Amino acid sequence: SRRRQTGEPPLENGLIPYLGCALQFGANPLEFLRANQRKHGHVFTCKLMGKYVHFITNPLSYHKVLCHGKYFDWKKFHFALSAKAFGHRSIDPMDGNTTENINDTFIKTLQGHALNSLTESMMENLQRIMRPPVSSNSKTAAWVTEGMYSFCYRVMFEAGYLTIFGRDLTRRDTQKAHILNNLDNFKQFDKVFPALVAGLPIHMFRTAHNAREKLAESLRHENLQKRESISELISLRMFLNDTLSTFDDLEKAKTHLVVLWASQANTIPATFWSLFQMIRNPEAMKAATEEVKRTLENAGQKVSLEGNPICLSQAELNDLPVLDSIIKESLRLSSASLNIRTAKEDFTLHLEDGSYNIRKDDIIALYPQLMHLDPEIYPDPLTFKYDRYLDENGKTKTTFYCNGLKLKYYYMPFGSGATICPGRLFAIHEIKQFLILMLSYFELELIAKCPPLDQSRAGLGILPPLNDIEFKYKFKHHH
């Protein structure tokens, strides 16, 4: 059994399978980490996910781990997690199944030119999905009540699925069927994801296991080749699977399920929280409505449920500081990411207050929700302030302080440094696009107090609400 040696952080006893475990027995991961801070100070070690994880919780020390460092491996743990949760052989190029640099693939196809086409495609897809079936106005005249999470889930999943994996236009009559099946199968697989990253076998979850494998079946190359308007990301990944890997057909299908998960698992809860917080807070709703109305006015874009679609420029979509602030403030409150790297050798990590001996293969982790909810940095941290990331000029605020010192890293739901989401710009675009179309197509009302976060997914990104909340919507801008 492991014993603390001199210079190593305080070592907590106990085995924690995963961060969101045991909520039914009264666990609370945020409060658990905060209790460890009070007990041990800003650095402490836990046995978590079968590793020894050093938590660095001083915001002033984040820069020392988020920089590139000779002793940091920022891919090892993620590679192992993917192989384990999705079921494929090692994608670590050291293990010889592939020579692809996947970071390079993502950056090339989610940023730059590729981001522009993705963004246009998402906007077309969102409009096809959110617009009512071309029929009488009486069909869409009344208020409709639905769970908001459930609504966001189906719109964003379908739009995101078709944007990333293209569309099958050979059989249009059955695509509602296939999408609903894919949607249901993804819900069932993602449900058990916290357990899978803990090392629990997917065999323990029969329906989830079946769902994962049916999803993989739909993403076999033979099936993707039937589709049109496929993202450059998946086109390239198909090509690099074929030319740079020795993966079998199923494993190639699994690599696309990985990307499906990556594109959906955070975006869906992010969209929910942004919509909810916007509707819940009258000032936010008012500010967002005016910003979007003005942008569409200035861009000469008419809103209609049928006919001409909205086409915004890349600058018009990016220069939406009120929507940006609403999204950032929604993620500040809901984000529960683990930012990780693995010690390449024994070394001493030099931080703000102290220096700490780290062993080879130990994990050095940040849990930035601790910073996001820190009242020293964000006064009234549990309050949604739609303008929290707006300065006096109504532009995006970038000045935040801890102990009077200006923070470089103050907002981290996408990570930072090398450990950062390559899809972040596309994510912000798709949420903005969703919000724009919601404000433009619908009148919107709640029926609802703010649900707590579901911490069973602690470490996996944006936390969903513990329970859905009902809202009502009604189409506007009819003929």
Among 262, 331, 358, 365, binds ligand 0GV (CB under 6 A): 262
The reply on whether position 338 binds ligand 0GV by CB under 6 A is yes
Our finding on whether 10 is near a second copy (CB under 8 A) is no
Distance CA 417, CA 267 (A): 20
Asked whether position 152 contacts ligand 0GV by CB under 6 A, the answer is: no
Nearer Cβ to ligand 0GV (61/255): 255
Please report, as a single letter, which amino acid is at residue 22: A
Distance CA 454, CA 269 (A): 11
Residue 141 near a second copy by CB under 8 A: no
267 binds, among ligand HEM, ligand 0GV, a second copy, none (CB under 5 to 8 A by kind): ligand HEM
Residue 26 engages a second copy in binding (rule: CB under 8 A)? yes
Largest pairwise CA distance in the chain:
75
Residue 457 Cβ vs a second copy, minimum distance, rounded to whole Å? 11
Measured distance CA(461)–CA(222) in Å, rounded: 32
- Which of 59, 69, 160, 194 lies at the binding interface for a second copy (CB under 8 A)? 194
CB of 445 to ligand HEM, least distance (A): 25
Nearer to ligand HEM, 179 or 412 (CB): 412
Q: Exactly one of 152, 460, 463, 469 binds ligand 0GV (CB under 6 A); which one? A: 460
Is 456 an interacting residue with respect to a second copy (CB under 8 A)?
Answer: yes
Evaluated on CA atoms 454, 202, 154, 166, the torsion sign reads positive
186 in Cβ contact with 157 (< 8 Å): yes
Give min distance, CB of 170 to ligand 0GV, in A.
27
Q: Which is nearer to a second copy, 16 or 331 (CB)?
A: 16
* Alpha carbons 309 and 324: distance in angstroms, whole number: 23
Residue 450 annotated as binding?
no
d(CA 479, CA 135) in angstroms, rounded, equals 11
Give the shortest CB-327-to-ligand HEM separation in angstroms.
Answer: 8
| Side chain identity, residue 14 | G
What would the DSSP string read from start to end of 323-383?
HHHHHHHHHHHHEEE-EEEEESSSEEEE-SS-EEEE-TT-EEEE-THHHHT-TTTSSSTTS
Q: What is the DSSP string of 80-133?
A: HHHIIIII-----GGGSSB---HHHHHHHHHSTHHHHHHHHHHHHHHHHHHSPP
Q: Does 203 bind a second copy (CB under 8 A)?
A: yes
Partner interacting with residue 419 (select from ligand HEM, ligand 0GV, a second copy, none; CB below 5-8 Å by kind): ligand HEM
Does 207 help bind a second copy (rule: CB under 8 A)?
yes
Q: List the one residue from 11, 115, 129, 200 that touches a second copy (CB under 8 A).
A: 200
Among 9, 59, 459, 464, binds ligand 0GV (CB under 6 A): 459
- Indicate which of a second copy, ligand 0GV, ligand HEM, none lies near residue 110 (CB less than 5 to 8 Å, by partner kind): ligand HEM
> Are 125 and 162 contacting, i.e. CB atoms less than 8 angstroms apart?
yes
Binding residues: 421
